[PDB]
Design a protein around this ligand. Sequence first.
Ligand SMILES: Nc1nc2c(ncn2[C@@H]2O[C@H](COP(=O)(O)OP(=O)(O)O)[C@@H](O)[C@H]2O)c(=O)[nH]1
Lengths: 168, 156
Amino acid sequence: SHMTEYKLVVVGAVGVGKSALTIQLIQNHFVDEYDPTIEDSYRKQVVIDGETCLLDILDTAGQEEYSAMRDQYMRTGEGFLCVFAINNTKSFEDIHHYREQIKRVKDSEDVPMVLVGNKCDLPSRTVDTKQAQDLARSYGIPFIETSAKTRQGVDDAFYTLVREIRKH
Amino acid sequence: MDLGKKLLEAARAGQDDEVRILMANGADVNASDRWGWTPLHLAAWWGHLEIVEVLLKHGADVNAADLHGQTPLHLAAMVGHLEIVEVLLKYGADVNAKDTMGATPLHLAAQSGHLEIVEVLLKNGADVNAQDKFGKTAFDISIDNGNEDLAEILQK
Ligand SMILES: Nc1nc2c(ncn2[C@@H]2O[C@H](COP(=O)(O)OP(=O)(O)O)[C@@H](O)[C@H]2O)c(=O)[nH]1
C-alpha cells in the first residue's frame, strides 16, 4: 500500500509482562487465554492520530540475557518500550541498564522511548508513581501505567511510542 | 556463596547493619554484578545515603566504572540524589568521568534538569566544555531542551 511500518521493541527484565503486553495488543486477551502455536501474529494495523500505520512488535522475551540476539533486536528496532513491573524493585533498576544499552547499540543520546510500569491492576505497589514519574522526567521520556490483564493503558503505551518516533 | 554477592544484595535492600557486618567479615567492597554495578552504584541509584557513607569510609572505590562506563556520581547526579553527590565529591569522585557515550555527570544532571546538582558539580570543578561522543556539551543540552535557568547556570 505505502503505509508506514513502525518496529517497536519491548525490553525489560524477565517476568515484567512483555509477552503479556504483546499478546494483549495483538490478540486482545490476557495470558489465561493465550494459546501458543495458534496465535502467531506479530503485526497489527492501527489508526494513530488519524493516520493509519502498521505496528511490528519485536519482543525480547526469552532472549533478555542473550546479548547477541537482544542487541540485534535493538539495532533492528526504531522505538523501545522499557517495561518494569510496579511490584518489582529490581525490574525498575534494570530499566537504567536497558536504556543505556539501547543508547549504545543505536548510537544516539536521543532514541525514541517510553517508560512502562506494568501490572498496575495490582494493589500495594512497591515502586510508587512519583518515583517512576521522576525517573521518566530525569530521562526526558513519557511514563505510562499499563495492565496487560485489564487492557488499561496498553494501546496508550504502544501508541505513545509511535508518537515519539514521529516527532524525533 | 561469595561475601561480595551478599553485600550487593544487602546494599540494594538498604540494610545498613547487614552492610556493616559483611564489611566486618571481609566482604569485597568493590564486588560487582553482571552490569558492573558495585554496592556504591546501587546505594547511589536507590538513594541509600548512610550506606554510601559507610562504603566510602571503609575504602570503596569512589570512581568504580560499570560496563557502560558509569560511576556512582553519574547515577546520583542523573537520578537527583544531592546529598550522595556531595559525599561522593568529598571522597574525590571524578566530577568529569566520561561514560562510553562520552557523557559526564554534568551532562546527565543537565539532561535531568537537577539545577542544584548542576551548581554543586560546577562548584567542584565540572567542565562545561566537556564534549560527549557526538560533540555536545552540557550547555548544548540546555539549549536543545529550552532550559533557560540551566543555560544561565552553565554560562555563569
Ligand atoms: N496481574 C497482572 N499480571 C501480569 C500482567 N502482565 C503480566 N502478568 C503476569 O506476570 C507473569 C509474567 O508475564 P510474562 O508476559 O511471561 O513476562 P515476560 O517474561 O516479560 O514476557 C505472568 O504470570 C503473567 O500472567 C498484568 O498486567 N497484570
